[PDB]
Amino acid sequence: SISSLGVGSNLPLDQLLTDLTKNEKGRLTPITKQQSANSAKLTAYGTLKS
Amino acid sequence: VINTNSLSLLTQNNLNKSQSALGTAIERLSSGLRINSAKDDAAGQAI
Amino acid sequence: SLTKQYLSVSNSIDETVARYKAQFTQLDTMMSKLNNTSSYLTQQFTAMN
Amino acid sequence: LAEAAATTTENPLQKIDAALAQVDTLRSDLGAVQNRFNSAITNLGNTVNN
Amino acid sequence: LTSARSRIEDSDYATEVSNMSRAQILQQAGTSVLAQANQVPQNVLSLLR
Amino acid sequence: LTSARSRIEDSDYATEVSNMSRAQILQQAGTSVLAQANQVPQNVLSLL
């Protein structure tokens, strides 16, 4: 459920964790680039067929 | 009487009890979970 | 293949985030005791004076 | 050294699929061992705390 | 089933916060009285001298 | 390679924060203790 990290240590742990979560997902970007490129190629193939 | 501070001892024990309770509360609060070890609830973990 | 890799990476990232969260929880628990400790030392030795 | 092509190779698809199968086998094994390592590091963390 | 598991597991925010507050109050009081009780003997004894 | 270098090189926020806290507690203690230690021979002479 909901959590309130930092209750005891009164630290910025919560912001820190959010930044970590944002940072790690960076590994996804190359996959997204390749997916988009291949999708564009497929769409171009359809265009040619028309 | 010099050789022993009974009041100090009692206060120490009460402080230990209070700190125990505080830790119990804080861990649950932070995790958001009522169960964090086998001690909290025997049947809860199984179910 | 790209989709498979995407799912794998998602799983790994979620696990790593959860691990960091557990570490942070453990840290938060101890900080309470240590702060109480510092405060008590302050009061005690200030009173000794 | 790899000798020259005596003739046209028989059943090329068979060999292509055999190589692909071996490659996918290795990919799967290396994927699983990573999860093994994940479990191991989690164990180490918990034991460290205790 | 997810609902049932969540209701068996998830802690209650209200109760947790409520108990936490009282615990902290007791903790502060404990430290203070501890130091006070240390000092009280000290002075009785030295004054008797 | 970037990930590998990061893992080999970076430090753990949690462990280091804990160490800092413990060391601060030790510093407070030791300071007070040295004060009292100096005070003790002082009262020895005083009672002299």
UniProtKB/TrEMBL annotation, chain A:
Domain of life: Bacteria
Compartments in which it is found: Secreted; Bacterial flagellum
Signal peptide from the UniProt entry: none
Membrane-spanning parts: none
Function: Required for the morphogenesis and for the elongation of the flagellar filament by facilitating polymerization of the flagellin monomers at the tip of growing filament. Forms a capping structure, which prevents flagellin subunits (transported through the central channel of the flagellum) from leaking out without polymerization at the distal end. Required for morphogenesis and for the elongation of the flagellar filament by facilitating polymerization of the flagellin monomers at the tip of growing filament. Forms a capping structure, which prevents flagellin subunits (transported through the central channel of the flagellum) from leaking out without polymerization at the distal end.
Family: Belongs to the FliD family.
Assembly, per entry: Homopentamer.
Protein name (Swiss-Prot/TrEMBL): Flagellar hook-associated protein 2
Organism of derivation: Salmonella enterica (Salmonella choleraesuis)
Gene name for this UniProt entry: fliD
Whole-protein residues included: 3 to 52 of 467
UniProtKB/TrEMBL annotation, chain B:
Domain of life, per lineage: Bacteria
Subcellular location: Secreted; Bacterial flagellum
Stated role: Flagellin is the subunit protein which polymerizes to form the filaments of bacterial flagella.
Family: Belongs to the bacterial flagellin family.
This protein's name: Flagellin
Lineage per the UniProt record: Bacteria, Pseudomonadati, Pseudomonadota, Gammaproteobacteria, Enterobacterales
Gene: fliC
Residues of the full protein shown: 4 to 50 of 495
Automatic annotation (TrEMBL), chain D:
Domain of life from the UniProt record: Bacteria
Subcellular location: Secreted; Bacterial flagellum
Role summary: Flagellin is the subunit protein which polymerizes to form the filaments of bacterial flagella.
Family according to the record: Belongs to the bacterial flagellin family.
Protein name, per record: Flagellin
Organism: Salmonella enterica
Gene: fliC
TrEMBL record, chain F:
Location of the protein in the cell: Secreted; Bacterial flagellum
Record-stated family: Belongs to the bacterial flagellin family.
Function: Flagellin is the subunit protein which polymerizes to form the filaments of bacterial flagella.
Name of the molecule in the record: Flagellin
Native source organism of the sequence: Salmonella enterica
Gene of this entry: fliC
Span of the entire protein shown here: 447 to 494 of 495
